[PDB]
A paper describes a structure:
Systemic [name] amyloidosis is an increasingly important protein misfolding disease that is provoked by the formation of amyloid fibrils from [name] protein. To investigate the relationship between mutation, disease manifestation and fibril morphology, we have determined the cryo-electron microscopy (cryo-EM) structures of several [name] amyloid fibrils, which were isolated from the amyloidotic tissue of patients with hereditary [name] amyloidosis. Based on cryo-EM, however, we find essentially the same fibril structure in all patients, demonstrating that the mutations do not necessarily lead to different fibril morphologies. Each molecular layer consists of two discrete density regions that correspond to two ordered segments of the fibril protein: an N-terminal segment, extending from P11 to K35, and a C-terminal segment that spans from G57 to T123 of TTR protein.
Each patient was heterozygous for a different mutational variant of the TTR protein (V20I, G47E and V122I, mutational sites refer to mature TTR). The second patient is a woman (TTR G47E) who was diagnosed at the age of 56 years. She suffered from carpal tunnel syndrome and severe cardiomyopathy and cardiac surgery was performed six years later. For the three fibrils we obtained spatial resolutions of 3.18 Å (V20I) 2.37 Å (G47E) and 2.99 Å (V122I), based on the 0.143 Fourier shell correlation (FSC) criterion. The site of the G47E mutation is not seen in the 3D map and located within the internal disordered segment. The most abundant proteolysis sites occur between residues F44 and S52 and thus within the internal disordered segment of the fibril protein. The internal disordered segment is not seen in the 3D map, and it is partially cleaved off in the fibril, as demonstrated by MS. All three fibril samples contain both mutant and WT TTR protein. A superposition of the three structures shows that the fibril protein folds are virtually identical. The backbone root-mean-square deviation of all 92 resolved backbone Cα atoms was analyzed with Chimera25 and found to range from 0.5 Å to 0.7 Å for the three structures.
Numbering used by the authors:
A (entry chain F), B (entry chain E), C (entry chain D), D (entry chain C), E (entry chain B), F (entry chain A): 11 to 35, 57 to 123
The structure:
């Protein structure tokens, strides 16, 4: 008998992020997985992935150049932070 | 008999991030996994991944260049930090 | 009889990050794993990973160059730090 | 009979980071593992990993250069430090 | 009968980082492990890892150069240090 | 009968880092281990690790150069030091 009980009696007003999981039992392969339940990706780069079988196999002249040079600003006040009875502000 | 009990009686208003998991039982392979339940990726780079079987196999002239040179600013006030009855501010 | 009991009676308003896990039982391989439950990756780089079987196998002329030279600023006030009845501020 | 009891009665408002785990029982291989429950990676580099079987096998002329030279600033006020009834500030 | 009891009665508001684990029972291999429960990696470098079987096997002319020369500043006020009723500040 | 009891009655607000573990029972191999429960790595370098079986096996002309010469500053105020009713400051 598997019994899982989470946050059953709540009185008041909290801030929650519940993640309950119960399990009873050619280049990239994945199986039976739970990924990115509460994930966050900011300014994330992937230039060359899984190009394929036999890419640039013979006599390949290639110049890979990657220039990440910029005036980019990211300002997050409450990233993944539940809060109760509080004050959150970004003042520029 | 498996019994798991988490945060059953809450009185008041907290800030919570619950992650409850119960389990009863060609180049990259993964199986039976739980990844990035509460992950965060900021300014994350991946230039060449899993290019493939036999890439650049014969007579390959290649110049890999990666220049990460920029005025990028990241300011996070409460990254993954639940908070109760508090004050959070970013003042620029 | 397996019984796990976590934070059952809470009175007041705390700040919590609960992570409860119960288990009853060609180049990169992984199996049966729980990774990055509360992970954080800031300015993380991966230039060449898992290029593949037989990469640059014969007569390969390659110049790998990686220049990470930039005016990047990262300022985190509460990184993975739940807090109660407090004051958090970034003042620039 | 396995019984695990953690933080059962909490009165007041603390700041907690609970990590409870209970277990009852071609180049990189991993199995049955729990990694990075509360990990943090700041400015982390990995240039060449798991290139593959037979990489640069015959007559390979290669110049690996890695230049990490930059005006990058990282300022973290409460890294992985839950705090209660406190004041946290970054003032530039 | 295995019984583990941690922080059962808490009165007041402390700052805690609980890590409770209970267990009842081709180049890199790992199995049955718990790694990086509360790890921190700042400015961590890995140039060449697990290149593969037979890398640079025959007649390989290679120049490995690694130049880490930069104006990088890291300032952490409370790294892995839970604190209660305190004041934490970085003033530049 | 194995009974482990840690920090059962806490009155007041301390700062704690609890680590309770109970166990009842081709080049790098590891098994049955718990590593980096509260680890910290600052400016940590690894140039060549686990290159592989038969690397640079025949007629290899290689120049390994590693130049770590830079204006890098690291300032940590409370590294792995929980503190209660205290004042922590970095003033530059």
């Amino acid at each position: 008998p598997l019994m899982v009980k989470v946050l059953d009696a709540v009185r008041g007003s909290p801030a929650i992020n519940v993640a309950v999981h119960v399990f009873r039992k050619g280049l990239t392969t994945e199986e039976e997985f739970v990924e990115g339940i509460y994930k966050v990706e900011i300014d994330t780069k992937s230039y060359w992935k899984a190009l394929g079988i036999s890419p640039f196999h013979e006599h390949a002249e290639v110049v890979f150049t990657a220039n990440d040079s910029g005036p980019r600003r990211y300002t997050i006040a409450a990233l993944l932070s539940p809060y109760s009875y509080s004050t959150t502000a970004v003042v520029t």
